[PDB]
Design a protein around this ligand. Structure first.
Ligand SMILES: NC(=O)C1=CN([C@@H]2O[C@H](COP(=O)(O)OP(=O)(O)OC[C@H]3O[C@@H](n4cnc5c(N)ncnc54)[C@@H](OP(=O)(O)O)[C@@H]3O)[C@@H](O)[C@H]2O)C=CC1
Ligand SMILES: COc1ccc(OCCCCC(=O)O)cc1Cc1cnc(N)nc1N
Length: 186
């Protein structure tokens, strides 16, 4: 199994969601970036795994579920089986990560991408080990009801460059944003 990563888009006020959707209007190229980063596998014969909470799963339009070309794993203690369209179900992040070591997935999974929501990000971000955060900074305030956890910059280093990630300011629908990559190893 390859690297462990989180990927998020966040507003200036740390918002990541409102009422089960994104706080800002659709940013088509930003979605394309998410698709590209989570799908592209560094290893022949493997796919990336996406891990998400139950609310995050149901926030994805049905037509985009499961995220194509990726193994889709949902976290829930209430559900008894994976939701329609999903591939795997685990009752904790630790369980999900342990699952990727089992014979059914050990040789199938390259990168793992945690795609939300808040509690899943928080657990991942405070878990000892090597972790990257792929963070899109949406450069305005948007009304939100779910927030990204604090990034401890003592541990997470903002990388000065990363291959395949544009370094300059992007703009869609009059909204400026920029891509960042953070890395910790503890
Ligand atoms: N801007 C961005 O990049 C992103 C934005 N979002 C937005 O965030 C909004 C809300 O996400 P959020 O409210 O944080 O919800 P989550 O997706 O984390 O879902 C919360 C629910 O997921 C299960 N769950 C979460 N963590 C675990 C765990 N560690 N172990 C077992 N089960 C778990 C549910 O458990 P159970 O069934 O047991 O009660 C829990 O009630 C979404 O609607 C989405 O629009 C989401 C991802 C990215
Ligand atoms: C749960 O996070 C997301 C899941 C899907 C999504 O739609 C993107 C469409 C891409 C099509 C595909 O991948 O097949 C958007 C999000 C939110 C999200 C957005 N942007 C970034 N950088 N990270 C996210 N988690």
């Amino acid at each position: 199994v390859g690297s462990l990563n989180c990927i998020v888009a966040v507003s200036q006020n740390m918002g990541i969601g409102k009422n089960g959707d994104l706080p800002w209007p659709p940013l088509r190229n930003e979605f394309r970036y998410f698709q590209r980063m989570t799908t592209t596998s560094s290893v022949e014969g493997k796919q990336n795994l996406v891990i998400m909470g139950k609310k995050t799963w149901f926030s994805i339009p049905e037509k985009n579920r499961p995220l194509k070309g990726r193994i889709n794993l949902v976290l829930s203690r209430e559900l008894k089986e994976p939701p329609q369209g999903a591939h795997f179900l685990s009752r904790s992040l630790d369980d999900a990560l342990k699952l990727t070591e089992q014979p059914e997935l050990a040789n199938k999974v390259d990168m793992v991408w945690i795609v939300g929501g808040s509690s899943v990000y928080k657990e991942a971000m405070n878990h000892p080990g090597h972790l990257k955060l792929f963070v899109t900074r949406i450069m305005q305030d948007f009304e939100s009801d779910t927030f990204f956890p604090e990034i401890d910059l003592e541990k997470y280093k903002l990388l000065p460059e990363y291959p395949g990630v544009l370094s300059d300011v992007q703009e869609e629908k009059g909204i400026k944003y920029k891509f960042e990559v953070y890395e910790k190893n503890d």
